[PDB]
Symmetry: C3
Subunit: 340 residues, 3 copies
């Protein structure tokens, strides 16, 4: 909600309270999304100041406050800053920002990341260019310097992040994307390669000294209709765990397909139908193994722009003999969202 707007500076303080619950049989250990209370709340700000007609400054921070922990020792579990960056937009020359932000490949994956509660399986956090990462410098151009409406691109420099954990670490890398949007249609191609840290390489699964990720996306967004499609691949980038051996590392290779179709009724109901499949190839010891494989049926009802509720049902297609131990049970999310 725009809580401030004077002297060319407007601040938007936003946030949401999400009452959420997951339903899965058993202890949800073998299910797709887990089982039980998953309530949480978000709080963040979006600032934008007009330094003059062509130059705009801006900044954004967003935090995740878990609402399913006790007030005891476990109180902070799951709490984190999602975004934190600042930047400048200049006329038609483009924009540049730095800090914790979305990797460029997400410019692709963003297409299908539209399910009510699940979806966007391949958009992992602190995983190179697919989701939110720290230390990214990002340049973005819109409409090819104003010369070609609908043609956009971005380049992104990822700075090395040596964390205590191989899963949350990364070496330096570069990534870019090109997308074109013409009247309800949109197409994108995104790609990024990077160095893997010593620790990442010291992991049991996966083998290489470079990490790659590219995805393409197609979408039809108009007339209350939303059909989007994604296909991407990766090398030594996708994090995987062998639940049996308790071994971890990255998939040597994965081929990812995400499909989504939705419709927005004028009365507030937005039904959703999706399909996701991500399969690892050449996993040391296992061979080819599905990481994600399901159908999704769900719906969101919007009371207005501030209130809504939804049910997200995952019809898991992963089978019980999945070599890595990926769960095979279904998961049903019900939630009630307030937001400003």
């Amino acid at each position: 909600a725009e809580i401030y707007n004077k002297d060319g500076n407007k601040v938007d303080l936003y946030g949401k309270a999400v009452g959420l619950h997951y339903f899965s049989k058993g202890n949800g250990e073998n299910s797709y999304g887990g089982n039980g209370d998953m309530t949480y709340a978000c709080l963040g700000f979006k600032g934008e100041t007009q330094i003059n007609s062509d130059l705009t400054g801006y900044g954004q921070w967003e935090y995740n406050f878990q609402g399913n922990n006790s007030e005891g020792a476990d109180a902070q579990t799951g709490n984190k800053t999602r975004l934190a960056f600042a930047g400048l937009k200049y006329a038609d020359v483009g924009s540049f920002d730095y800090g914790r932000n979305y990797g460029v490949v997400y410019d692709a994956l963003g297409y299908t990341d539209m399910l009510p509660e699940f979806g966007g399986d391949t958009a992992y956090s602190d995983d190179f260019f697919v989701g939110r990462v720290g230390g990214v410098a990002t340049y973005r151009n819109s409409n090819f310097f104003g010369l070609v409406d609908g043609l956009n691109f971005a380049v992104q420099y990822l700075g090395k992040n040596e964390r205590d954990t191989a899963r949350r670490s990364n070496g330096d890398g570069v990534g870019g994307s090109i997308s074109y949007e013409y009247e309800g249609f949109g197409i994108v191609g995104a790609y990024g390669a990077a160095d893997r840290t010593n620790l990442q390489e010291a992991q049991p699964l996966g083998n290489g000294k470079k990490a790659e990720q590219w995805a393409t996306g197609l979408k039809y967004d108009a007339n209350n209709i939303y059909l989007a499609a994604n296909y991407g691949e990766t090398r030594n980038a996708t994090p995987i765990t062998n639940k049996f051996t308790n071994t971890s590392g990255f998939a040597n290779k994965t081929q990812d397909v995400l499909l989504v179709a939705q419709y927005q009724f004028d009365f507030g109901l937005r039904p959703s139908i999706a399909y996701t499949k991500s399969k690892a190839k050449d996993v040391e010891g296992i061979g080819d193994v599905d990481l994600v494989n399901y159908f999704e049926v769900g719906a969101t009802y919007y009371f207005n722009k501030n209130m809504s509720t939804y049910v997200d049902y995952i019809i898991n297609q992963i089978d019980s003999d999945n070599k890595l131990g990926v769960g095979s049970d279904d998961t049903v999310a019900v939630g009630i969202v307030y937001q400003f």
Copy 2:
């Protein structure tokens, strides 16, 4: 403070900075409330949107930021989300919300939870239905569907929370309350029973497979006067620790009495007089032992609706030979509160 209110959506951003200090002899280890700096600050939001004339959506999140930690490793100690839920209110049909909220028995205990700094001893957190818990679905009706002014009730479903700690865990349960308020008078009855988790049962103290809690309250609230009274009981629900053996678990049984009398002078001074006693029965090994037992004399002065100060003095009646090791020294809290 209502920082936003447009298009039927109003957001209230609130918070307080509390300079606080406890005075107790010794290392406050044997005193009632501890000794030293207890400064803290709170920040939260309360949103409410009018979906139309009969339907209202809403949400609330509230966080506790300890202000007595260093900027070192201990910086996060005591930090937590107190509330986090969303819900809908429909005409005279009632309201329903879900997320982290107050257990139904607190509908009773809330009566005497009015001391300047202490009080509400029996309203523990993550303790079934007495204080704030996670995963509660709560339905509340006011004025019996609009048919009977002053008659209100609530039912509440508690979802199982299996935490690493027996103290912060719980099984599924149900609770409800009925209260009636007629011209300054108010009466309530609250009750809830629930399953105890494996771990809770694996504890040394307490013995059962179900946890119960009920409290009743009477109050006179009018003409600058506030006299409230509470009496409740519990079975295998109250958490207790034997400081000697370092053993823990829950009291098999407790009988709780809380008394409060206060007066609001027109010039801002609100003196307070209270009495609290909670006694455990059949504690394995000890027998009958007082958990809480004191008198309270204190005062709050309100400069205005945003500023105030207070002194809360606990005249501890617990004696030095208390079998569990509950402290016997007095505690005096002084604080200065700014709030918006």
Copy 3:
């Protein structure tokens, strides 16, 4: 940004998103400021209510959210509340506040704590009276009860803080300051002494039962010019670590000199030139050792009051044979700040 102002109560919600990066050779282990992403964001509030013409209440809380952590286990690293206090200002009698705030000696050190990114080396946190500490009661008088324009003083009572760490602990103490400001000129003297805790005394380095710190400052602040100077000394107060032996404690004695000169161009550019040197004396085992020693060249450009960028370059004068192991490499900070 003043987001609220009604009925004599105004709240100012402020914050900033800082994209920041450090450049140092090697693993920045031997450099002055480290190497890599140092992005972060701040959020805090400042409230002030007019209880009447002479009496003002107020409160302030400020939090630091690190933006260079992953969304994993390390997510909370570096997060902390910087300030948290409440107080009252009465006519010309002065003000008094309590909670986490700035120690009185900082009334001196504040003079030179003006570098774009570095500087204020001696203003440590949770280090008695030099930086932010918890549990400080502070009385401040301005203009000597209104009788002498420009004459100000403060007294401060520090309450004992026994933390798990000797570095973050403190015993009771008292401190005061006197400063005088006449037309662009300002002079200050600050001093404080305190008890050292058992644990602090149990440390290998440093020897005493009392901790002292005093600093004086001179400054010329006018006509776009800023020249400030600080000289202070300490006894058993400055925390020091022997990187070789991995030993820690406090310097028996230190002599600190901080120098700063800056100029604000009308077009937004504020160049900066500074010099800092802090040298420990009588360090058990080493003798005299420099703790900090460098020159600083840097610049800040202000697009407007909400946006800016800067480069801070540290020309480290510490030499590679520094007995304690203090790093000798240079560090260059580049950052882009959005703030409201």
